[PDB]
Design a binder for this molecule. Sequence first.
Ligand code: UDP
Length: 351
Amino acid sequence: MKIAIINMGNNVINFKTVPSSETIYLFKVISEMGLNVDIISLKNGVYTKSFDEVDVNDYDRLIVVNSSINFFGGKPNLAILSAQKFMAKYKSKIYYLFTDIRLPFSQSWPNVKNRPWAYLYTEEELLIKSPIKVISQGINLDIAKAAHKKVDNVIEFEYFPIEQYKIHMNDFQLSKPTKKTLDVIYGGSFRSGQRESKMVEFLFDTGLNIEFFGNAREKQFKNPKYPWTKAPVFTGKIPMNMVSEKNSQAIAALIIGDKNYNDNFITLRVWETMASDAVMLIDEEFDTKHRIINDARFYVNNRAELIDRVNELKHSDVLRKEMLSIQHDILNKTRAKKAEWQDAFKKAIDL
Ligand SMILES: O=c1ccn([C@@H]2O[C@H](COP(=O)(O)OP(=O)(O)O)[C@@H](O)[C@H]2O)c(=O)[nH]1
C-alpha cells in the first residue's frame, strides 16, 4: 500500500507558505498513522519527490489537497498544470481533501484551452476523468455537493475533520503561559473579501490593542458596506508552525469563519487557538449550538460583547486562567480520540 499526496496548485517545499505547510503536515500525520506516503511536487526535496521521477500509477491511492486553479496574470502556473497532468494520468479514484469552501475541485483545461498559450497543452493531457471522492472538512455534505456541482466526475462525498491533524501530531503540545502584549489577535488572509463583514465587526474600532497577522493588509478593507475608522495593527505573515506561539501573545484570539462555515466547518484556527495561551472567543453565529465548548463565556455575538468579554478577562486573571484550563482540557478530550480519528481517515480513503 503506497500513497501519493499532492497539492493541486501550490509548490511544496517547507513551512514558509501555508499551502506547503498543510501538505507536509498531512504527509506527516498520515505517516504517523502507519501508512507509507510520498509527497509529489515540482522538485525532489526534504519532504518531496518530483512529478518527473515517479509513475502516478505506482501508487494505490492518490490524495489531493484543494487549491485554486486560477492563473495569476493569465500566465502558466506549473504547480497547477503539473499537478493536473499528474492527476489526469491516474487511472483509479482520486481523493480530494476539501478544507477550504472556496477551493472545490475544478478542471484547468476549460480555462487553459482559451489561453493564447493553449497550444502548449492538450485536453487528453489536462482533463481529469477519474472518479473523485471529496473528503469534506465540513459536516454539511449538501454544501460540499453544491460546491462541486460543475464537475460531474466528483461522485462521492464523506465528512472527515481533516483539520484535527494539528492536535493529533506526535509533536503537539499546549502553549505555556506567555507574557501578554495584546488584547486580541487574529491571523489569516483576506480570503478575497469572503469574511470582510465579520473581520470589521470584531477586529476594527474596538478600542482594544488588536493585531491582525498574516497575508491580509489594511488597504484591502474598502467595502463601503462595512466602513471603519480605526483598524487593528497588521503585521506580516508567519510560518504555520509558529502560529500558536503568536496567538499566545494575546489575552484572547478570535474565531470567525465564512458564511458557509457556520455550524459546518471546524477550522485549523479553532485548534491553534484552543491550544494557545490566548482565551478562545467564538462568534456565536460560527457555532450556534456551542459544539466547540459547552460554556457561553467563550462566545460573543457582536463587537460590543467582544469588548465586554475582553475587559472581563483583563479584569480577572482568575477568570482568564479558568477559561484557559477549560479549553485546554476540551482540546485534550478530542486528542483522546486519536485512534478513532486515524481509523476514520483510513476508512475515508478506502483502507
Ligand atoms: O501568518 C499566518 C496567518 C495564518 N496562517 C495559517 O492560516 C490559517 C488561516 O487561514 P485562512 O486565512 O484561510 O482562514 P480560515 O478560513 O482558516 O479561518 C491559520 O489557521 C494558520 O494555520 C499562517 O500559517 N500564518
